[PDB]
Amino acid sequence: QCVNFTTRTQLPPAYTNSFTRGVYYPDKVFRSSVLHSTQDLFLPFFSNVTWFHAKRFANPVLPFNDGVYFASTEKSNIIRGWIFGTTLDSKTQSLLIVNNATNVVIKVCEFQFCNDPFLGVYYHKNNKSWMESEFRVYSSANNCTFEYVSQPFLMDLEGKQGNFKNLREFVFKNIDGYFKIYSKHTPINLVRGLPQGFSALEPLVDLPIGINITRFQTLLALHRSYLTPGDSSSGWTAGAAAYYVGYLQPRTFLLKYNENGTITDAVDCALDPLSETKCTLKSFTVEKGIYQ
C-alpha cells in the first residue's frame, strides 16, 4: 500500500493554453461597469499548464508556487482529494482536504500519506448501495490536535448532463495565514482541452489554518473494479478524465464589471505592450496614436 510503483511511461505531458482563464473576484466589494485594477496573484494568459491524464496514474507531488490553480473537467467524480502542507509528512502536520458525496472534511492529523492511496466505489455491491470502500488514505492518524468539517460538496450533480463534463476550477489562494478557495461550475462541450472565454470564480471559505505550505498533492482516486487487486496502483489506473494545474505569479489585471457586477473581460498588462497600453489608458478601446 504505502510502497508501490506506477503503470505508465516517463512523463509524456502536454502544455495546452486556455489563452484566458482564472479570474476569481479578488476583492470582497461589488462594482458595476467599473474597470478596477489590482496587483494580485493571478494566472497569466497564454501560459503552459501541464496536462494530467487520469488514465495513466498521473498525480505526483506538486510545489505550492504562490497559490495553485487546479482545474478539472469530467463526467464523473474522479478527482476528490487535495493534500498539501510544508513537506507532507506526519511530523510536520500537513493539511488534508478531500471530497465526499456525504460531507467534506479538513484535518491536520499526522499522516505519512502512504504514497497517495487511491479512492473508489465498489461497483454494485448492492443494488441501492454506492459507497467508497478502499479508503486507505489514512496513514497513522494520531496527535491530530485539530479537526474540522464543512459544507458537503454537492453541486457536482448538475451542469454535466449529456457528457458535458462541467469544468471546475479551484484556485488554492493563500494570504500568508489565511486560505481561500474559489470555484466555478459552467457546462462545456469542448473535449480537446481548455475552453476559451473567461471565468467568474467566487470565494468559498475564508477560514485560516496558520500552517505554511510549500508542496501540494492531489488524490486522483482511481478505481476501475474491485475484482482485480493488482499491485494497489496497477489495474486501478484507467479513467476518462484529464485535469490541469496552474501556478500564480504577481500580476496586474484590468477587470471589467457589468450591470450585474459580473466580470466579462480581463487584460493582463504584462502580457503584451498592447495590453500595457490598455492598462495604462484604463479602457478596452485604445484610440490611434502614440502613448508613453
Binding site: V29, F30, R31, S32, E202, E259, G261, T262
Partner: peptide, 20 residues
Amino acid sequence: NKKFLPFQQFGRDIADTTDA
C-alpha cells in the same frame, strides 16, 4: 435595488467610495 451577488457585500463607485 442593486444586485450584490451573494459573495459580494460592499458596493463601490468609480471614485473609490462605498455607495451600497
